[PDB]
Give the backbone structure.
Amino acid sequence: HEKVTIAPLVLLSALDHYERTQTKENKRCVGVILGDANSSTIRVTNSFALPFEEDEKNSDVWFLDHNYIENMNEMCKKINAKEKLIGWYHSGPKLRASDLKINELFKKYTQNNPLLLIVDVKQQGVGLPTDAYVAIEQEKTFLHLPCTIEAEEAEEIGVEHLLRIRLTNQLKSLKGLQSKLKDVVEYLDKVIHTILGKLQDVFNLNNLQKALTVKTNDELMVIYISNLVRSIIAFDDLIENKIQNKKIQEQRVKD
Amino acid sequence: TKETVYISSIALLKMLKHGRAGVPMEVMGLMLGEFVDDYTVNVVDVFAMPQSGTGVSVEAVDDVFQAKMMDMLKQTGRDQMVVGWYHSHPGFGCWLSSVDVNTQKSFEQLNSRAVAVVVDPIQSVKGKVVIDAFRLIDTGALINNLEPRQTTSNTGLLNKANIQALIHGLNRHYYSLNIDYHKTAKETKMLMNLHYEEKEESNLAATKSMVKIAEQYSKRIEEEKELTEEELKTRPKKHLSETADETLENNIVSVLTA
Amino acid sequence: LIETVFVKNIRMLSFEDISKATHLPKDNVEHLVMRAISLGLLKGSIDQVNELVTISWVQPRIISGDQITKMKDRLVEWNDQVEKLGKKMEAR
Amino acid sequence: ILDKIFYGVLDQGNGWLYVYETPNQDATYDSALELVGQLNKVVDQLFEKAS
Amino acid sequence: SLVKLFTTNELMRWPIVQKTYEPVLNEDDLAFGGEANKHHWEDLQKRVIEHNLRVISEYYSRITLLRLNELLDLTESQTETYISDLVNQGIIYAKVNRPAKIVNFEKPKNSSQLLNEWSHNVDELLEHIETIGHLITKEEIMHGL
């Protein structure tokens, strides 16, 4: 499928709009993103912040000002003519029921499929909390795409100024397992469909990995064979340094 | 004297991306923030001025477009006034020309606290951003001639030629400054997200390597055979060590898949 | 018969197990099962020589609720093995 | 068979042709043996130049 | 309808049609116009035999020689005639075992090929876990309602 790539300028901007706005009482901060969604890799080069207010007890009441949409368009076209509105982002990982109503507001302004961006301001997860969903025909479903970081000298350089393998992956696997454990327990309390369909396919596709263990060790010893000649070459580097240091000792005594 | 000018971490990436996009034309944008007396300049958010082909002249500043955008920023949570503007100088150092100084004099009557910042997005790609600020004179600690800018430490004058010629004698239209950035505990982890999504991407390199696993180790061993004969004809080590180091890391990652 | 013979790694079936359910000889076993396999319902095949039928996992097997309580403890087993091996990688 | 045109093995007793021909695997023995053999000459030159 | 019978071919009704209904087979009107009964039927039986042999290589692991004569309706010498011809053409890969009177249609898999598909299976499980991970939050709206 497609891919989502976001520069750290957009990631840091969405995370800094929570403290500046001083949003409290468990509310959300909605903002718009700019970029080019026409290619297979969506690149977000710009982001903004718009005022958003929605009632917690009533999900049928929402308000969004359209002046900021027309004001930022006239502002960007006078600066960067290659940037258009590809969608919008939210302030939290948890999805609400208003995602379908907000999608109808930008469908007239956006000339392509609206991109749903999800950014966690709390950063209570592991790895990259930022999520990217794509709304397509289901009524409507949200297809998620992997989010990456843009590699360029216009962004990552400023990151290096501010700031300055499997062990991390195993901790990420525990996060995915705990999500399925709580989903099954909470499902039984509400009773006594798409999740159960894909759950039985995981078990049948690590008890099954033991059948290939006979053929697994075939390429495992090759690593040790590659490491055997790897360690032998390491002696030629250390012994040559000993011979080099031995010649330095003779130069200091004769001096 | 030396003065510490605090700049938010969000303002650095905005001023860098704006000036780096267009290489020529020497773009410009405004800033927002607060002040602490005369010895501290704080920058929170920055503003982006519209593009013009005049190269930062007296006609490149639109008061109509400036007044309409600031009214929308007050409703988005920005209560801070304009602390100055930044000007890009690609390929050169940090210095002010005759046009930049004359343009800077036009804003002295409006806001005397305005700060003219010289940013170089081109030469700042080495990991240390080269940037400097130039503040106007609001006095109140000064009148005619006095000694502002306490807390003198860290870097020196630098700049190029004329700006460092007169510092205490004429402080009016130009004097040197320093750049500092303020961070918090939450903003640190915001850029730490670079390293199960990455767990699947880590196995993608080993997935296609399983087909070539016979051809991958063969090209490395045959390469080490030619490097070994190089040391036999000596009577080298750097080329042999760098080749072997790439093979050691590839074997450990393959074990991680099991 | 697939869910009945399934224990851990073995979904394999024989001809006598199918011949008792369908009440048909070994000729009609390979005829009817292969038709359902070609439609995409099963990835497996049939071995006529050794009288063994290998069947993979394709059908999503709807009408759940029997295995929900069983698969819940299986996820705990995976959560425990990764946690135990994860703590061993921190010390060593 | 002896000319290496087609690898195979016959059977005189039962009169059959058993499965024989199989490919080889590189980067295991021949590549490792020739690599260690070249490194052995390097070690001999280390002690010679160390004195 | 015969196109959908390529993979499912049991050769039960194929010799029935070849001996009974030949509207486009031995009589051509709007395309070839017709030549002879042996001209169109020469390559006809060669392809119908190839229809089953391609399915066997992709489905059946091994089949006895006595069973191949019941399907293809050939003799012991005629069965291996069409099978050996497809091997030299680089289409069907099968090892005929005479002592066991069977034919091994399963292609040999090396140690690297078995571990290759294992790497795709591990990456496939991570795709299902990724799918289930985003379905919990999506379906949570109906749960928390």
